[PDB]
Design a protein that fits this description.
This is Signal recognition particle protein. It is found in: Cytoplasm. It comes from Escherichia coli O157:H7. There is one protein chain. By secondary structure, this protein is mainly alpha-helical. It has helices spanning 4-11, 18-26, 30-34, 41-51, 55-75. The chain has one domain (1-76): Signal recognition particle, SRP54 subunit, M-domain (434 Repressor (Amino-terminal Domain), Orthogonal Bundle). The protein has five helices and no strands. α4 packs across α5 (55-75). It is globular, with a radius of gyration of 12 Å. Bound molecules: potassium ion (3 copies) and magnesium ion (4 copies). It binds one RNA strand through α2, α3 and α4.
RNA sequence: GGCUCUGUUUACCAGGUCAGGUCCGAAAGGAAGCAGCCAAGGCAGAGCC
């Protein structure tokens, strides 16, 4: 069950992306990391400000996560 | 009802500490602040008033 914890560990095998991507996840709660679909507008705003990013950066991380979760489902 | 103890629970919506990330600064230095943790609140059991 590929989640943001798994993704975060993949980001830990950029700081031009990797450190910033890790930071966004580091502003999340464990429920958010476990079930990223619950992250809607208000949680995105909290995560963005808490990581010094914009909401569009959070959107981009979530999209990258989503693409990886789709690919892991299919490779498996 | 109050207080205490114990268990549990709680993204943000004036608490503390604030990793990471962020901001200001040439630096020296500063600042805001999410997660966690802590406090506190919620739900209960027990004890006391
Ligand atoms: K308690
Ligand atoms: K905090
Ligand atoms: K920090
Ligand atoms: Mg809080
Ligand atoms: Mg605070
Ligand atoms: Mg720091
Ligand atoms: Mg600078």
């Amino acid at each position: 069950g590929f989640d943001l914890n798994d993704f975060l560990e993949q980001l830990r095998q950029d700081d031009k992306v990797l450190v910033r991507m890790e930071a966004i996840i580091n502003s999340m709660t464990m429920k958010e990391r476990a079930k990223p679909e619950i992250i809607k507008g208000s949680r995105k705003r909290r995560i963005a400000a808490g990581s010094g990013m914009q909401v569009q950066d959070v959107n981009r991380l979530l999209k990258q996560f989503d693409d990886m979760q789709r690919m892991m489902k299919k490779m498996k």
